[PDB]
RNA sequence: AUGUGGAACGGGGUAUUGUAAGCAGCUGCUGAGAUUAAGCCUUUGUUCCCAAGAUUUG
RNA sequence: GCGAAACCACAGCCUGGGGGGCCAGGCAAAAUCAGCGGCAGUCAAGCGCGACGUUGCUUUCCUAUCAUACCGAAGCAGAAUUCGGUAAGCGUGGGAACUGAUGAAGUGUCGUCGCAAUGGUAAUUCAACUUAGUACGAGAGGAACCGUUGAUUCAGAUCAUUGGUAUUUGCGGCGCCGCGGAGCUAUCAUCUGCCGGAUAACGGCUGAACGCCUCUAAGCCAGAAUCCGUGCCAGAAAGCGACGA
């Protein structure tokens, strides 16, 4: 069930929740090997740590968990169809894996869709 | 110690046994006479210095493991200091640590004695010394972690106690028939015989009583068991349920039962009790009704009926205080090896074309497209029309 | 450099993929073959249905990536025998048919075309004088015999290539009492075995050959294992590539034909993932050794669509009939 | 009333559908999961496990009621043969194109009128009109357009969620002119359409559902009878 | 999991093969000699 | 988990089935384990299994002996205590306190030394006052002045273990 | 399958090869070609390249219409006769796309 | 609680043992040669094996003892098992 | 070292670009033109070629 | 085509032992080319001390496993944890001529076919579904087997789908730009990676020494990520066979 694999660490990536945060550094990546030549990367669908960069003062400098929803990475998806979104763009989730955004904005990855359902329901214009 | 999941406590000799055991195995076990003499100093050194590390290992997860009789509940903290002398065992935690601090100090000292190493012997010597003058210092520690042990199988046997959440005491008569009730109501149920204390230990047994958990805590008759019933029942947000036995068939007396009733009175205050009758089947207590918050409930021990009734009331006087196709998987093909078959599940007329394949595409367009109900309709109509146009 | 089972890296031999290991039998089983010979056409890419349980596409419609290989009627010309020794397995007699094509006699020359092509020309005459000669050499078979092997050489006429000598195998006969395969030896001679009474497009091929040169990384013999056939097609039949889902026939050689090896109008086999060896090198089918229990093969194999576009360039269509309803009428 | 796992997790909302006449089961779990929702109410109604657009969120993203059942653009027409195999000819069905296709996380339907979305499409509104037949009410659930999400629909009471005003709340049961019931599912949980499953003759909970939450939903949907 | 020579992967595969495909290759090669 | 809640327990719910059968068996077997785990053992593990060994036959002996009476650059590189400091003497080389054991009371209780008296090594020794064995070390005797004599060599040990010279 | 078609080459989109792309506003346009993906890409009309099928659309250079034969967001039940017709309904509309066109063709090039 | 089910096959030298705590392993016990083994009917959960050869006949009813032998728990609240009571002769 | 043989072209398919020159009043010719094996395919089309010298070994 | 020079006891295989040569071994076929604990005291085994005891303070290799496999023991219900054992195979505590490519020659010569002495090896861990909210457990927690599906690393191949190059000096536009086939490239893309015995700890059965007993003494079973064979890689260029003329 893996994805193209193009986004490192330490990176800043579009707030897209209702959580009010705009921008965040990309902190860690969730279960992710001890890949030499390649860094720890993760596509729309897996678990990551981010310092939110721009945004609320209170979730700025302050890490929690995040899932990435719009992948500007070629995600050669499982029907084969490749998909370019606009850029990358997420939504922060708690520890346990509660989306801190009432709503979404923006496109999530159907791939990313059926791991997460709490951050599902929150979505209505899934693409 | 009620969810305290503390590693056990080894003979101390056995304790030094793998210890210096780590010592053979992690550290490298050779050091060559041609070596540098800074380099053949912390051979013994590292060595040692990880064995004071490893020495401190141990220690503190034994220390971390002990917990603060202090910060434990006043019914926790005073029942453990009845139930195997916790001022001394603090004693030997006092024990535990300033000698580790002494462990400290004699290793650091043998470190800087060791930073000034001159020949290979003396500092074999020296590393035989600093391993067994720490050693002496586990062997005058000899009778300390007997005590812990079983502490730790007296905390491992000590289950949780619920007092935070709506309990009910059961304290009186040792074995006056309402165990039997307490046993037919909780999950758990302690045995019990015609012997004395037979009810010594408290019994955590979960129950629910009107969309709120009841949490059933045993309390001894009445010593040690006594006391420690005593000390429980100082401090918790329970209800007494003092069986009295009508006819005397617990072994004592109802002028008996209701002056000791009389006498734990003051711990029975600030709580509604339950004066139940037990033994119903089988003048003084007038004196114990004049308190008036005692339930009085009679209850035939012998016929084994009026338990749940007596539960109704000390409960809400508690609330007023306060095949399948799973089967046919099974025998398909078993989970996530049998395939469901969905042209079964069809409302179409043809049940063979129902189980038949359908042409999704066809010509390099959609055949479900340009597929209508009315198409045979259609297409006659069409053929006619194209028979039309060419004449 | 570590995978030093493959170690040391020296280029192979025989240009053919050659079986080393076959496959352990009985004789209560029936006569069957093991091996066959192929052909590399290319990679190619299908569409199909998956009835694999405890997936996460189960009942859904998944892309998979293939290979087309192209396989002649292959033609049996004779046996050799083989007695069992303290030294290993001797060949005892080799039985050959009476006639060979040219093809086939080609193999034995070098230059077929400037000799004599004086080939198994005696040896005709002491089949047409005495077969009981011949049933000498197959009385001293069914007598001494352990392993029966027959000969085998491709139909290279049948396959468009500028080889027109013959790739010569032998095929390990399994099953039976060994009086049993001489019998369906010689009840074959000289004709052709088909592909599809070897196969039942539900089981699995270890194939074999060649790697690519790479112009000493390369050329290196391989026996890669486990890819599953989906087609055993019929080059006489035109509706190998048109599954039941796509019904309007088409073939399954693309449009200018296929990169580096052109037009396919035979048999052939529709194999999984890849082979070593690049386009158009003989290629070799075989059984498998253990019988694997793996659902991927236990599963029944239905196709939905195939892609026939023009992998010469980018294509974007599936036939030349279909392409002119979608375009315009050109200027010709 | 039925208290289980999805499998995964006590959504169950979210992964499997249920209307009045036919129940939309997903595909690609346990049959225990489908066997759970067949003894339920397999005798009386239909259960299909099937797949919405090879995914596993059927609950979600698409509504249905009693007239029939519209689902999203982007649904395999293979998948529509099969739902118009598994569902009746009375059973409605319905493809709506629209930029949102999560019709089960933001619109909520019932046996007499419907809350739909205030972002939602005019002819999308329009074709849910005419498909499900329910007065359709175009407006936010406690301040979100994700009406499903943020509350549950059924034919004898409706839940809402507690984050909504009192005030708001009699608005809105008057709205639907049914009893809802301002509380949430899987004890406290955020999920409140996909907490909980309710249809007009069963209901269904999840495995981390309250004692009381539930006891509050059979209440609000005279499911004690 | 399990290992090359792991005889716990292979003692409950000896009784998976006994059932499964065993007999379905046997299906397989029969109509295969068939002419 | 044991005896408190589960014995009893396991009382009203049996036990296994052979749990006497096993434990005499290995007991019975145990009087012949015992010799290959001391023909078999070897290295320093077999040594420490022998010291037990060798402790057990000791302790066996006693008793049965009981039971039988029973039925009847210039730098100082060595500990010192505290132009002519030519050498150097470090700071946790220097030692202040000894652990001195009276001959007569047998009282190993450590005590400051409040002098050098004599080192038997060299005067210049005596002059910076190294701690070495056999030394004469003037220590306080107001708490047990007086001398005594190293009986340990401090260098190697790292404590100074002398025993007084009265 | 229901196949796609392209964005800016306006040909159809099949399996396995091309690329799908959704916009902010939930538009999902599909290229057919890597041309077409670069088209997309630099945002040229489709009706404004002569190599696409809008230009000689929106020029006169293409057929406009064709209604022959008198012919879906509703599922309906299957019937086996039902798309039997409908199989054959594709070849005869075929072959009168193939006239129709050939005479469109001759009006254009006249 | 989960009774261990037992099946004598090829005249009770192939032992179908299954259900072992409710396990799904397949517990197949192949008799040694020349014993036969038979689940004795007067005693429910008995299993009488009976033959020539002893040794056979035991270290067979010890392969049994070692088929469903348990694992991975406590041996003192998980207690109820194989065992062999009565070894004695055919006469 | 004479064949459904080969070489050089031509034809066709296939694709890459992008509607050719030029004509008339941006449009129609013009989804045209050009290119496509040099490690694309095909060829009943045209022309040409072929009856081989030397060496090694029995 | 012209054409040195340095240098030159004679030289050229490895292991061990007293270096190239010696001793004992491994072996050994031409001819060439490209990379390269102490002190004090009490005892007392025994021969004045005296043991165990008692009293005073202070790249690769190697297992000695850091995880994975398997078990043993523990207040080990379960989970989780501790100790011990096998175990260095693979991962995550220490040590330090070689590989390619031609090549004559016994087999009368050439060619096809397999044979196999030997040389190397391979897979790896992680988590998801039931099987379970079950057994168990007051509750809270929560088994394991089989079956199934994934992910990571490594290895092996593969260039349809996606990407990069233009000496296709190929197409077009204004030396510049758009495209750029093929070929090339890629966890940038894609497919695959197995099994049969024998064993360590350990658990056993039978059964003497020692009339009992005893997993042992002769036998015997089960039993490890363990080893050896299957399979996979190559084929002695002085190993060999059948057939073709």
Redesign the pocket.
């Known amino acids: 069930?893996?994805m193209?694999?193009?986004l490192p660490v330490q990176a800043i990536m579009n707030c897209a929740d209702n959580s009010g945060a705009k921008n965040l550094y990309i902190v860690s990546v969730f279960?992710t090997?001890?890949?030499?030549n390649?860094l720890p990367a993760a596509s729309c669908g897996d678990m990551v740590l981010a310092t939110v960069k721009k945004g609320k003062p209170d979730l700025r400098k302050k890490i929690m968990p995040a899932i990435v929803v719009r992948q500007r990475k070629?995600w050669?998806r499982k029907d084969?169809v490749?998909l370019y979104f606009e850029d990358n763009a997420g939504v922060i989730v708690n520890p346990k894996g509660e989306m801190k955004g009432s709503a979404i904005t923006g496109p999530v990855a159907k791939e990313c869709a059926d791991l997460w359902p709490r951050i599902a329901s929150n979505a209505g214009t899934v693409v | 110690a009620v969810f305290k999941?503390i590693?056990?406590i080894?003979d101390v000799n056995?304790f030094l046994?793998?210890v210096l055991?780590?010592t053979?195995?992690?550290?490298?076990?050779?050091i060559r006479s041609g070596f540098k003499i800074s380099r053949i100093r912390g051979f013994y050194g590292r060595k040692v210095k990880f064995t004071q590390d490893t020495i401190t290992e141990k220690l503190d997860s034994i220390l971390q493991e002990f917990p603060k009789l202090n910060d434990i509940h006043p019914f926790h903290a005073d029942l453990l200091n009845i139930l195997y002398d916790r001022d001394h065992l603090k004693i030997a935690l006092s024990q535990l640590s300033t000698a580790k601090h002494?462990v400290e100090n004699?290793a650091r000292?043998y470190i800087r004695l060791l930073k000034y190493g001159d020949s290979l012997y003396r500092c074999k010597?020296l590393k035989?010394?600093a391993?067994?003058?720490m050693?002496?210092?586990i062997k005058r520690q000899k009778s300390s972690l007997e005590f812990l042990e079983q502490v730790?199988?007296?905390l491992?046997?000590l289950?949780?106690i619920?007092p935070n959440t709506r309990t009910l005491l059961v304290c009186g008569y040792p074995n006056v028939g309402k165990s039997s009730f307490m046993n037919k109501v909780?999950?758990?149920q302690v045995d019990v015989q015609p012997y004395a204390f037979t009810t010594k230990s408290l019994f955590?047994?979960?129950?629910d009583y009107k969309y709120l958990?009841w949490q059933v805590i045993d309390t001894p008759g009445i010593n040690t068991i006594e006391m420690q019933s005593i000390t429980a029942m100082a401090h918790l947000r329970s209800a007494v349920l003092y069986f009295m036995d009508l006819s005397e068939m617990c072994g004592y007396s109802v002028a008996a039962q209701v002056k000791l009733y009389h006498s734990i009175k003051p711990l029975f205050a600030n709580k509604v009790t339950i004066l139940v009758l037990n033994k119903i089947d089988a003048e003084l207590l007038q004196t114990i009704i004049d308190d008036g918050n005692v339930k009085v409930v009679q209850t035939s021990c012998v016929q084994d009926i009026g338990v749940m009734d007596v539960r109704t009331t000390a409960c809400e006087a508690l609330l007023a205080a306060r095949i399948l196709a799973?089967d046919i998987e099974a025998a398909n093909?078993?989970?996530?090896?049998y395939n469901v078959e969905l042209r079964d599940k069809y409302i179409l007329q043809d049940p063979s074309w129902k189980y038949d394949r359908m042409p999704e595409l066809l010509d390099g367009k959609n055949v479900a497209d340009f597929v209508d109900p009315e198409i045979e309709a259609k297409l006659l109509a069409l053929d006619e029309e194209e028979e039309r146009l060419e004449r | 450099?570590?995978?030093?089972?493959?170690?040391?890296?020296?280029?192979?031999?025989?240009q053919?993929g050659?079986?080393?290991?076959?496959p352990k039998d009985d004789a209560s089983k029936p006569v069957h073959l093991t091996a066959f010979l192929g052909y590399?056409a290319?990679?190619?890419?299908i569409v199909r249905d998956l009835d694999?349980?405890?997936?996460?596409?189960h009942k859904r419609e998944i892309?998979?990536?293939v290979?087309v290989i192209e396989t002649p009627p292959m033609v049996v010309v004779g046996v050799?025998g083989?007695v069992e020794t303290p030294?290993?397995?001797?060949?005892?007699?080799?039985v050959?048919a009476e006639h060979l094509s040219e093809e086939v006699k080609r193999?034995?020359?070098?230059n077929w075309?400037?000799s004599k092509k004086?080939?198994?020309?005696?040896?005709?005459?002491?089949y047409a004088e005495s077969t009981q000669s011949i049933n000498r050499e197959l009385e001293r078979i069914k007598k001494y015999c352990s392993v029966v092997?027959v000969?085998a050489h491709t139909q290279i006429?049948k396959t468009?290539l500028?080889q027109k000598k013959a790739?010569?195998?032998?095929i390990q006969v399994n099953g039976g009492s060994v009086a049993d395969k001489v019998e369906w030896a010689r009840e074959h001679f000289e004709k052709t075995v088909d592909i599809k009474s070897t196969f039942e497009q539900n089981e699995m091929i270890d194939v074999?050959g060649?790697?690519?040169?790479?112009?000493?990384?390369?050329y290196?013999?391989?026996?890669?294992?486990?890819?599953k056939i989906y087609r055993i097609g019929a080059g006489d039949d035109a509706k190998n590539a048109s599954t039941d889902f796509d019904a309007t026939e088409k073939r399954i050689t693309p449009?200018?034909?296929?990169?580096?090896?052109?037009?396919v109008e035979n048999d052939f086999v529709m194999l999984?993932?890849?082979?070593?060896?690049?386009?158009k090198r003989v290629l070799t089918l075989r059984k498998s050794?253990?019988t694997?229990?793996?659902?991927?093969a236990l599963e029944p194999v239905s196709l939905k669509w195939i892609?026939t576009?023009?992998?010469?360039?980018?294509?974007?269509?599936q036939t030349?009939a279909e392409?002119k309803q979608?375009?315009?009428?050109?200027?010709? | 009333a039925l208290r289980a796992?999805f499998?995964?997790s006590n959504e169950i909302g979210v992964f499997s559908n249920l209307t009045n006449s036919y129940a939309l089961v997903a595909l690609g779990?346990?049959?225990?999961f489908y066997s759970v929702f067949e003894a339920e109410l397999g005798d009386v109604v239909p259960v299909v496990h099937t797949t919405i657009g090879g995914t596993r969120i059927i609950g979600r993203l698409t509504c249905g009621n009693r007239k029939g059942l519209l689902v999203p653009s982007s649904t395999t027409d293979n998948e529509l043969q099969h739902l118009r195999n598994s569902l009746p000819d009375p059973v409605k069905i319905q493809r709506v194109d629209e930029r949102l296709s999560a019709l089960g996380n933001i619109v909520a339907c019932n046996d007499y009128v419907a809350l739909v979305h205030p972002d939602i499409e005019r002819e999308t509104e329009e074709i849910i009109a005419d498909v499900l037949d329910v007065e359709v009410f175009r407006q936010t659930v406690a301040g979100n357009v994700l009406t499903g999400s943020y509350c549950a629909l059924s034919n004898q009471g409706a839940l809402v969620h507690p984050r909504t005003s009192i005030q708001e709340q009699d608005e809105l049961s008057s709205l639907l002119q049914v009893p809802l019931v301002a509380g949430t599912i899987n004890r406290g949980s955020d999920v409140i359409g996909a907490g909980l499953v309710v249809n007009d003759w069963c209901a269904f909970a999840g495995?981390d559902t309250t004692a009381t939450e539930l006891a509050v939903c059979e209440s609000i949907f005279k499911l004690q009878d | 999991?399990?290992?090359?020579?792991?005889?716990?992967?292979?003692?409950?595969?000896?009784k998976?093969?006994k059932k499964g495909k065993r007999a379905k290759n046997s299906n397989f090669s029969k109509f295969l000699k068939k002419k | 988990?044991?005896?408190?809640?589960?014995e009893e327990?396991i009382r009203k719910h049996g036990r296994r089935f052979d749990h006497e059968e096993?434990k005499?068996?290995?007991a019975?077997?145990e009087?012949?384990?015992a010799?290959?785990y001391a023909q078999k053992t070897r290295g320093i593990?077999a040594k420490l299994y022998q010291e037990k060994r060798?402790?057990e036959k000791?302790?066996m002996?006693?008793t049965i002996?009981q039971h039988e009476e029973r039925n009847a650059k210039r730098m100082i590189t060595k500990a010192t205590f505290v132009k002519y400091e030519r050498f150097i003497r470090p700071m946790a080389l220097r030692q202040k306190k000894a652990?001195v054991?009276?001959?007569e009371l047998?009282?190993?209780?450590?005590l400051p030394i409040i002098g050098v008296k004599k080192n038997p090594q060299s005067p210049t020794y005596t002059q910076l006052g190294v701690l070495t064995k056999g030394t004469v070390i003037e220590v306080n005797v107001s708490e047990l002045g007086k001398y005594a004599q190293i009986?340990?060599?401090p260098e190697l040990?790292?404590?100074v273990?002398?025993?007084l010279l009265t | 399958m229901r196949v796609h078609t392209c964005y800016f080459c306006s040909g159809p989109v099949y399996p396995?090869?091309?690329?799908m792309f959704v916009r902010n506003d939930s538009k999902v346009f599909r290229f057919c070609?890597?041309?077409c993906?670069?088209n997309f890409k630099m945002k040229r009309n489709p009706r404004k390249v002569?190599?696409?099928?809008a230009?000689?659309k929106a020029?006169?250079?293409?057929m406009v219409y064709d209604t022959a034969l008198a012919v879906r967001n509703v599922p309906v039940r299957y019937d086996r006769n039902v798309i039997a017709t409908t199989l054959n309904a594709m070849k005869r509309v075929s072959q009168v796309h193939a006239k129709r066109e050939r005479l469109f063709?001759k009006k254009?090039?006249? | 609680?989960?009774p261990i089910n037992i099946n004598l096959t090829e005249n009770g030298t192939v032992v179908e043992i299954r259900n072992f705590?409710?396990?799904?392993?397949?517990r197949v016990i192949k008799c040694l040669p020349g014993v036969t083994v038979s689940i004795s009917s007067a005693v429910k959960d008995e299993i009488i094996l009976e033959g020539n050869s002893?040794?056979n006949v035991?270290?067979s009813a010890?392969?049994i003892?070692?088929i469903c032998?348990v694992?991975?728990?406590?041996?003192?609240?998980?207690l109820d098992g194989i065992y062999v009571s009565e070894?004695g002769n055919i006469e």
């Open positions: 069930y893996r193209t694999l193009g279960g090997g001890a890949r030499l390649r070629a050669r084969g490749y | 999941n590693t056990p080894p056995t046994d793998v055991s780590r053979q195995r992690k550290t490298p076990t050779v002494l004699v000292d010597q035989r010394a391993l067994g003058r050693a002496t210092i730790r199988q007296h491992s046997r289950p949780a619920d909780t999950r758990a955590v047994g979960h129950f958990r799973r093909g078993g989970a996530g090896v | 450099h570590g995978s030093l089972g493959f170690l040391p890296r020296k280029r192979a031999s025989r053919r050659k079986v080393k290991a076959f590399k290319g990679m190619t890419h694999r349980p405890g997936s996460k596409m892309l998979e990536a290979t050799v083989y030294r290993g397995l001797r060949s005892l007699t080799t050959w193999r034995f020359y070098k075309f400037k004086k080939a198994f020309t005696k040896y005709a005459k002491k092997r000969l006429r468009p500028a790739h010569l195998m032998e074999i060649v790697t690519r040169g790479k112009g000493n990384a390369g290196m013999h391989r026996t890669q294992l486990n890819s449009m200018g034909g296929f990169v580096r090896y052109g037009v999984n993932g890849a082979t070593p060896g690049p386009v050794l253990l694997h229990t793996s659902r991927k892609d576009a023009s992998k010469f360039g980018h294509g974007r269509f030349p392409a979608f375009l315009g009428t050109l200027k010709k | 796992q499998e995964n779990g346990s049959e225990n495995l | 999991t399990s290992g090359p020579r792991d005889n716990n992967r292979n003692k409950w595969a000896k998976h093969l | 988990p044991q005896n408190e809640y589960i327990s096993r005499r068996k290995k019975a077997r009087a012949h384990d010799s290959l593990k060798r402790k000791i302790q002996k006693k002996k652990n054991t009276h001959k047998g009282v190993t209780m450590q009986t340990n060599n040990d790292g404590c273990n002398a025993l | 396995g090869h091309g690329i070609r890597s041309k993906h670069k002569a190599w696409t099928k230009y000689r020029h006169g250079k293409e063709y254009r090039l006249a | 609680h989960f705590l409710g396990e799904r392993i397949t002893l040794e035991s270290q010890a392969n003892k070692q032998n694992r991975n728990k406590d041996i003192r609240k998980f070894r």
